[PDB]
Design an enzyme around this catalytic site. Sequence first.
Site, PDB file in Angstrom:
ATOM      1  N   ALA A 152       0.810  -1.199   0.000  1.00  0.00           N
ATOM      2  CA  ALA A 152       0.000   0.000   0.000  1.00  0.00           C
ATOM      3  C   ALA A 152       0.860   1.273   0.000  1.00  0.00           C
ATOM      4  O   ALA A 152       0.352   2.342   0.337  1.00  0.00           O
ATOM      5  CB  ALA A 152      -0.962  -0.039   1.197  1.00  0.00           C
ATOM      6  N   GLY A 174       1.910   1.534   8.829  1.00  0.00           N
ATOM      7  CA  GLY A 174       1.915   1.032   7.466  1.00  0.00           C
ATOM      8  C   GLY A 174       0.534   0.979   6.826  1.00  0.00           C
ATOM      9  O   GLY A 174      -0.498   0.893   7.485  1.00  0.00           O
ATOM     10  N   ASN A 210       6.990   1.280  19.719  1.00  0.00           N
ATOM     11  CA  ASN A 210       8.369   0.909  19.379  1.00  0.00           C
ATOM     12  C   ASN A 210       9.357   1.700  20.191  1.00  0.00           C
ATOM     13  O   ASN A 210      10.376   1.163  20.620  1.00  0.00           O
ATOM     14  CB  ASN A 210       8.734   1.055  17.890  1.00  0.00           C
ATOM     15  CG  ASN A 210       8.069   0.037  16.978  1.00  0.00           C
ATOM     16  OD1 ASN A 210       7.617  -1.022  17.421  1.00  0.00           O
ATOM     17  ND2 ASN A 210       8.075   0.328  15.680  1.00  0.00           N
ATOM     18  N   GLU A 223     -11.899 -12.843  32.096  1.00  0.00           N
ATOM     19  CA  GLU A 223     -12.124 -12.184  33.387  1.00  0.00           C
ATOM     20  C   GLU A 223     -11.329 -10.893  33.509  1.00  0.00           C
ATOM     21  O   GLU A 223     -11.825  -9.883  34.039  1.00  0.00           O
ATOM     22  CB  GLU A 223     -11.744 -13.141  34.532  1.00  0.00           C
TER      23      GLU A 223
HETATM   24  N1  LIG Z   1       7.957  -3.440  16.726  1.00  0.00           N
HETATM   25  C1  LIG Z   1       8.073  -3.685  15.410  1.00  0.00           C
HETATM   26  N2  LIG Z   1       7.630  -2.677  14.563  1.00  0.00           N
HETATM   27  C2  LIG Z   1       7.727  -2.903  13.211  1.00  0.00           C
HETATM   28  C3  LIG Z   1       8.244  -4.088  12.741  1.00  0.00           C
HETATM   29  N3  LIG Z   1       8.259  -4.073  11.380  1.00  0.00           N
HETATM   30  C4  LIG Z   1       7.756  -2.915  10.985  1.00  0.00           C
HETATM   31  N4  LIG Z   1       7.435  -2.145  12.122  1.00  0.00           N
HETATM   32  C5  LIG Z   1       6.838  -0.819  12.220  1.00  0.00           C
HETATM   33  O1  LIG Z   1       5.850  -0.727  11.221  1.00  0.00           O
HETATM   34  C6  LIG Z   1       5.852   0.554  10.694  1.00  0.00           C
HETATM   35  C7  LIG Z   1       5.750   0.285   9.227  1.00  0.00           C
HETATM   36  O2  LIG Z   1       4.719  -0.675   9.156  1.00  0.00           O
HETATM   37  P1  LIG Z   1       4.718  -1.976   8.198  1.00  0.00           P
HETATM   38  O3  LIG Z   1       4.479  -3.310   8.891  1.00  0.00           O
HETATM   39  O4  LIG Z   1       6.006  -2.243   7.520  1.00  0.00           O
HETATM   40  O5  LIG Z   1       3.701  -1.519   7.033  1.00  0.00           O
HETATM   41  P2  LIG Z   1       3.114  -2.514   5.914  1.00  0.00           P
HETATM   42  O6  LIG Z   1       2.261  -3.362   6.812  1.00  0.00           O
HETATM   43  O7  LIG Z   1       4.136  -3.427   5.265  1.00  0.00           O
HETATM   44  O8  LIG Z   1       2.379  -1.619   4.762  1.00  0.00           O
HETATM   45  P3  LIG Z   1       3.071  -1.055   3.409  1.00  0.00           P
HETATM   46  O9  LIG Z   1       3.419   0.421   3.404  1.00  0.00           O
HETATM   47  O10 LIG Z   1       2.139  -0.951   2.236  1.00  0.00           O
HETATM   48  O11 LIG Z   1       4.242  -1.984   3.048  1.00  0.00           O
HETATM   49  C8  LIG Z   1       7.138   1.238  11.060  1.00  0.00           C
HETATM   50  O12 LIG Z   1       6.719   2.466  11.618  1.00  0.00           O
HETATM   51  C9  LIG Z   1       7.824   0.348  12.059  1.00  0.00           C
HETATM   52  O13 LIG Z   1       8.014   1.048  13.271  1.00  0.00           O
HETATM   53  C10 LIG Z   1       8.672  -5.066  13.594  1.00  0.00           C
HETATM   54  O14 LIG Z   1       9.123  -6.049  13.028  1.00  0.00           O
HETATM   55  N5  LIG Z   1       8.595  -4.883  14.983  1.00  0.00           N
END
Ligand SMILES: Nc1nc2c(ncn2[C@@H]2O[C@H](COP(=O)(O)OP(=O)(O)OP(=O)(O)O)[C@@H](O)[C@H]2O)c(=O)[nH]1
Lengths: 439, 419
Positions: free
Chosen positions: A99, A143, A206, A253
């Site tokens: 996306a 994301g 995070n 609970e």
């Molecule tokens: N805690 C943690 N946060 C993550 C991780 N991977 C990505 N993020 C967080 O996710 C955010 C980006 O979200 P994504 O999971 O990569 O987004 P997406 O779901 O792939 O969506 P797209 O843009 O279309 O690829 C960032 O701000 C990161 O902080 C992870 O493995 N652990």
Amino acid sequence: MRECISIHVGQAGVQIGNACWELYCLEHGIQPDGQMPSDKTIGGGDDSFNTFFSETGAGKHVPRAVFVDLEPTVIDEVRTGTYRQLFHPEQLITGKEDAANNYARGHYTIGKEIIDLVLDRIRKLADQCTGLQGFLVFHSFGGGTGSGFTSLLMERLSVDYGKKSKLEFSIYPAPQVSTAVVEPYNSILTTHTTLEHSDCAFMVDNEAIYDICRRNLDIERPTYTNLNRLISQIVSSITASLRFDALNVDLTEFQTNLVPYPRIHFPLATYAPVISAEKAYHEQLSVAEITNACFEPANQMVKCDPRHGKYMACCLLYRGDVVPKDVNAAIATIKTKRSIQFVDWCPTGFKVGINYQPPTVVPGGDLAKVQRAVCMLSNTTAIAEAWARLDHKFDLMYAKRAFVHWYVGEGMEEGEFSEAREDMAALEKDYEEVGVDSV
Amino acid sequence: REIVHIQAGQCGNQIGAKFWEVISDEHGIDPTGSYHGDSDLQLERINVYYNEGNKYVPRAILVDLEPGTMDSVRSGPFGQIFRPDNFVFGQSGAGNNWAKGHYTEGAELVDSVLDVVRKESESCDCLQGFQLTHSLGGGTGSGMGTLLISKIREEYPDRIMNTFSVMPSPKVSDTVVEPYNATLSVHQLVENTDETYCIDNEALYDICFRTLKLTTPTYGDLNHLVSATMSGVTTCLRFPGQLNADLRKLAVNMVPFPRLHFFMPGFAPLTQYRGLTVPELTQQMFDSKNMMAACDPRHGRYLTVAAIFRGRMSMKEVDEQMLNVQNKNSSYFVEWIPNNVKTAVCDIPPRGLKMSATFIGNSTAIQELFKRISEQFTAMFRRKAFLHWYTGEGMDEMEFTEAESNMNDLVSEYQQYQD
Ligand SMILES: Nc1nc2c(ncn2[C@@H]2O[C@H](COP(=O)(O)OP(=O)(O)OP(=O)(O)O)[C@@H](O)[C@H]2O)c(=O)[nH]1
Ligand SMILES: COc1cc([C@@H]2c3cc4c(cc3[C@@H](Nc3ccc5[nH]ncc5c3)[C@H]3COC(=O)[C@H]23)OCO4)cc(OC)c1OC
Ligand SMILES: Nc1nc2c(ncn2[C@@H]2O[C@H](COP(=O)(O)OP(=O)(O)O)[C@@H](O)[C@H]2O)c(=O)[nH]1
Ligand SMILES: [Mg+2]
Ligand SMILES: [Mg+2]
Ligand code: NA
């Protein structure tokens, strides 16, 4: 019985779900081929671990979950990963385009393509379950898949499963690991959309997890792998009442006590003890130590001050060598020392559960195996601070309508933005109302 | 005069299970249902709670919305003695919502249960009425329990209805919403029970913690006092004697006014080889710290009182003690009810005690208990906290308001007569 179907949307969703599942295999004695030697019953059973792991004639214990990501890359490593045999091909679902960090793209333009197939796989899993309890959704606000497709799937699950449970593990965006400038937008919008479809939402910042690893694990630049492994420990403590079963207390609970009102369904979580394997050597952590740790603000998954606010519920989910007596003492002590203020409408008690199953750490982990751990969940009004920060960013960019064109071209409308923001402002005022003392 | 016992929910099923075990021992029935007692007394009124290969089967129906609790009982020592068909449970569970039990997920199983009850009531030569065990502050026994009572009352409106209701307490709480479930249950009982033994899960703790010196009482601890109290009150029914109490006569003598059918149980020795003296038993029996309800009798006035002393002891000395208590404590006895206290002696002592005393009193102090529950309800209900869990089932705040009110009236009534 009481099966739970686990749904992992987005990269963060997927990876965090690979952490979790590994840890759950390690805890339950499930091997990477799925064969659980401990489980004498083959093809079935009623064991607690069956609520999260289904079984086959061969004795293989397949996870009950579905990994959906609009780009193949992330789920592909699962397909080829160590635990690739555990999962089943249909359970992994990957499109061809992401996306591009756009809620709009992930909710409408792309999501719509895969949404029907996703719901389809969920439905198959749902038929396996004799009494499905609800869904566990893992995503990230920032994301486009983690926001736009995740809300879409929430609406669909509302419609198709009605009022079945729908819990959540939402990754609060952290500038340290920020991937998109527009992540505050996606956060507001997804929070707005799923707020009516989520029974209980656990947020993990995070930034807060990044700090914990640098401090307690002495990691210089914690990686998503570090975070994920710590995250899985928290998740495992929360789900431990479901996967394992005298002192253990069902998370329902806790849920009936951590949601005073429908919109207030975001509880704070604090886990202990996070310690390095050197530091844990020649140090024994008492129930009292871990219990303090829970009430320590640097140990919380979301960065907020509970003192600034009031507690509406405070639950302590322990695991390991713990005895009620020690838990009673430590709690009292805490009280004597801490300022655990409660809303007047709420009873100033601590619901506790002890799951004697001791905690496990993935090999090569930076977390030292401990004989006791605890993860307290609290419904304090401090959580609002979170929203605020975010909201405030959202307002900054939205005044200059920045990046707004990217949403509009997918078909969204500024109305959606303003409406979403209003709802966040209402949520923030709702927190303030619940803290007000009764007349 | 058979008594159809009925146990619902976790708490209800746990305490009821011990009650059966205890009275089976006293009546010399082992887990297999066979009898090996050395005295015929045991078999003389065994039919009050058992039906007879010359084996006695408890006249008990187990009820739950989840198998777990009932499966444990089946695995228990006497699990064999309980009739398998009498086991009656579902899989949904009541998530600690009166609603979920009294409305949503109970309306189903209730019918199934009424069928077993009907079967037990048919075999009974003279149905004395029904005995029920449940925790007013949970979901199956709080909500579904009161529902079965109502159903039962419609089918058997000529039978006595008695409930051992376990009043929830903050000291021993499971969920914040326990006051709500209690208040609803209280009002159900006010109307559809002739006799209700209020066993506060609070007191029990206290007793255990303080007196019995137990730092971290478990639910078993409390249950142990409960089973003992149970055997006590039920003695006169189980064992033959001078006073063959029955449910109806019990209500006729202890209930001056209907709504006021809530009693404070009391037991001594609160457990030992040193048998207490008849004076000792008598001073402990009336001792607040020996009552299973967490109310001070001195704060109210005894409408009616009934005592039983099991074990070999001086009947005369017993009568003397009782007389002394009444005379020294005349202010705590309503004048308008002449002879409001009565005692009875059973030769067979409780299990493992040379002699004991059980106290059953309709004291106006019982209002304290309902006031506690009402305050809690008020605290949360003023802000509508957690109410969505009930509104989701189809309930309405008005219904919470009504139940809240009724319990306040009942509190008022106890006070009126108190003064
Ligand atoms: N805690 C943690 N946060 C993550 C991780 N991977 C990505 N993020 C967080 O996710 C955010 C980006 O979200 P994504 O999971 O990569 O987004 P997406 O779901 O792939 O969506 P797209 O843009 O279309 O690829 C960032 O701000 C990161 O902080 C992870 O493995 N652990
Ligand atoms: C403490 O002992 C018990 C007393 C009773 C009540 C009872 C309760 C009272 C009371 C008197 C009586 C007494 N009433 C009675 C009946 C017939 C009579 N015939 N001739 C005289 C006479 C007297 C009991 C004899 O039968 C009952 O059920 C009655 O005074 C104020 O409260 C029930 C019991 O079961 C639980 C019981 O065991 C613990
Ligand atoms: N004395 C006693 N109280 C109990 C027991 N089990 C539960 N309770 C109380 O019952 C209340 C909760 O109800 P529960 O048993 O779980 O009811 P359910 O929904 O029908 O199972 C809580 O206040 C506990 O205090 C028990 O075994 N003994
Ligand atoms: Mg991606
Ligand atoms: Mg319960
Ligand atoms: Na149903």
